[PDB]
Design a protein around this ligand. Structure first.
Ligand code: K2S
Ligand code: ZN
Length: 140
């Protein structure tokens, strides 16, 4: 599990979005595994605007933050998970690292702030859904 709390927005994995998230829906994209919903309180996280390929991610299934190198946001093919089939996914970044289904939502962060959230796992790879292209997250 895990979310980004930027201003009055909540950024979650589409596949972990709650009824409350869908009832307060701002934006959602199955191809990115992202959903954004409205909050009443302001959040404590800030979003990276950058092309960094190094950062640190939280891995719940190890209670550990790992420094990683990761690919630039891309269109990757993903093998079947407990929560999705084998399929393609967009705006995905890959690193070498541990990712189990429940690690989804872990933040990846660089020197500029939050880069994305864990979205995929398997074969000693962790995939992150990028949020850095979501400039609209900064305002309104
Ligand atoms: C960055 C971006 N904009 N539009 C798409 C599609 C993407 S992508 O990350 O999916 N791509 C580079 C493969
Ligand atoms: Zn950065």
């Amino acid at each position: 599990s895990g979310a980004i709390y930027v201003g009055n927005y909540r950024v979650v994995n589409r596949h972990l979005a709650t009824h409350n998230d869908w009832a307060n829906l701002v934006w959602e994209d199955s191809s990115r595994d992202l959903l954004v919903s409205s909050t009443t309180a302001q959040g404590c996280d800030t979003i990276a605007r950058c092309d960094c390929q190094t950062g640190v991610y939280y891995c719940s299934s190890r209670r550990k933050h790992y420094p990683v190198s990761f690919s630039k946001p891309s269109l990757i093919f993903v093998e079947a998970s407990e929560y999705y089939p084998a399929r393609y996914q967009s705006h995905l970044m890959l690193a070498v690292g541990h990712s189990e289904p429940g690690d989804c939502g872990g933040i990846l962060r660089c020197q500029h702030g939050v880069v994305g959230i864990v979205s995929t796992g398997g074969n000693g790879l962790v995939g992150f859904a990028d949020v850095r292209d979501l400039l609209w997250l900064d305002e309104e």
